């Protein structure tokens, strides 16, 4: 049960991490300090747009 809940929490954080940088609203003078992670590209190659 504990490992299942921790997996749920980590997946929620991973989804939030990807959406935060993918937000179209941050383009953006703040876009100067945003980098695309390697895990982000794997998500986009999988789920498209």
């Amino acid at each position: 049960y504990h490992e299942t809940i921790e997996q749920k929490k980590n997946n929620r954080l991973l989804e939030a991490r990807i959406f935060t940088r993918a937000n179209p609203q941050l383009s953006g003078a703040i876009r100067l300090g945003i980098e695309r992670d390697s895990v982000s590209r794997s998500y986009d190659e999988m789920f498209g747009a």
């Binding site: 179209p24 383009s27 876009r31 100067l32």
Partner: protein, 48 residues
């Protein structure tokens, strides 16, 4: 600026033969801005 995020990362890509691209001579745009379209994507930034 635009030079950093895209023009460097284009050079960081491995060549079609592979790899690196380091030490090669490039030719790049001085300034780049968004023209239009359905959306402002990351935008195709070209490095030759």
């Amino acid at each position: 600026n635009v030079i950093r995020n895209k023009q460097i990362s284009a050079m960081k890509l491995t060549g079609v033969d592979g790899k690196s691209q380091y030490g090669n001579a490039f030719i790049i745009a001085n300034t780049v801005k968004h023209y239009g379209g359905y959306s402002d994507l990351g935008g195709p930034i070209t490095v030759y």
